[PDB]
Paper text:
Meiosis requires the formation of programmed DNA double strand breaks (DSBs), essential for fertility and for generating genetic diversity. DSBs are induced by the catalytic activity of the TOPOVIL complex formed by SPO11 and TOPOVIBL. Here, we show that REC114 is a direct partner of TOPOVIBL, and identify their conserved interacting domains by structural analysis.
We then determined the crystal structure of the complex formed by the REC114 PH domain (residues 15–159) and the TOPOVIBL559–576 peptide by X-ray crystallography (2.3 Å resolution, Rfree of 24.9%, and R-factor of 22.6%). The structure of the TOPOVIBL-bound REC114 PH domain (two perpendicular antiparallel β-sheets followed by a C-terminal helix) was essentially the same as in its unbound form. The TOPOVIBL C-terminal peptide folds into a single helix that interacts with the REC114 PH domain β-sheet formed of strands β1, β2 and β6-β8, burying 731 Å2 of surface area. The interaction surface on REC114 is formed of highly conserved surface residues. The C-terminal part of the TOPOVIBL peptide forms a 310 helix where W572 inserts into another hydrophobic pocket of REC114 made of R24, V53, C102 and R117.
Author numbering:
A (entry chain A): 13 to 31, 47 to 108, 113 to 148
B (entry chain B): 560 to 574
Write the structure that this text describes.
C-alpha cells in the first residue's frame, strides 16, 4: 500500500507449459496457498506472486521489443520472446473484476501497448 | 500463429 508500487488481486494465473506434457499450470487465491497478486513497481518491474513465491518477474522498461499483452474483458494474455501466461482479475461482480483489469491496463500501457483481439 | 491461437483460446476463461 506504498506510493512505490501498484497491486491488484488475481482470481487465477495460468502458465503456458509448452515453450505427461500439461499445457497449463493454473494457480488460484487460496487461504492455505496465499493470495494471487499482480504488482507493478513505479521503477517498471512486473511481478505475480502467490503468498511469498514469485511466479513471474521482469522489467516492463524497453519491453515493446519482446513483450505482447492482449486484454479480453477481465483477462490479460502476456507473451515474451519464448514464454506465455494469462491472468484474470478478481472481484465480487463482473464489473469490479473489469474495473480492476482496466486500472492495471492503465499502468501497463505506460510501458507497452495493451492490444484488443 | 500460436499467439493468435491462444488470443482466441483466452475465451476458455470468459463469460
Amino acid at each position: 500500500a506504498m506510493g512505490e508500487v501498484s497491486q491488484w488481486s488475481l482470481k487465477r494465473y495460468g502458465r503456458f507449459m509448452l515453450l505427461g506434457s500439461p499445457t497449463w499450470k493454473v494457480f488460484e487465491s487460496s487461504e492455505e496457498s496465499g493470495s494471487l497478486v499482480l504488482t507493478i513497481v513505479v521503477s517498471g518491474h512486473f511481478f505475480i506472486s502467490q503468498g511469498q513465491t514469485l511466479l513471474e518477474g521482469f522489467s516492463l522498461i524497453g519491453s515493446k521489443n519482446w513483450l505482447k499483452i492482449v486484454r479480453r474483458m477481465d483477462c490479460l494474455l502476456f507473451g515474451t520472446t519464448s514464454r506465455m501466461f494469462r491472468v484474470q482479475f478478481s472481484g465480487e461482480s463482473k464489473e469490479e473484476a473489469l474495473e480492476r483489469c482496466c486500472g492495471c491496463v492503465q499502468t501497463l500501457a505506460q510501458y507497452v501497448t495493451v492490444q484488443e483481439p | 500463429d500460436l499467439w493468435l491461437q491462444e488470443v482466441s483460446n483466452l475465451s476458455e476463461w470468459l463469460n
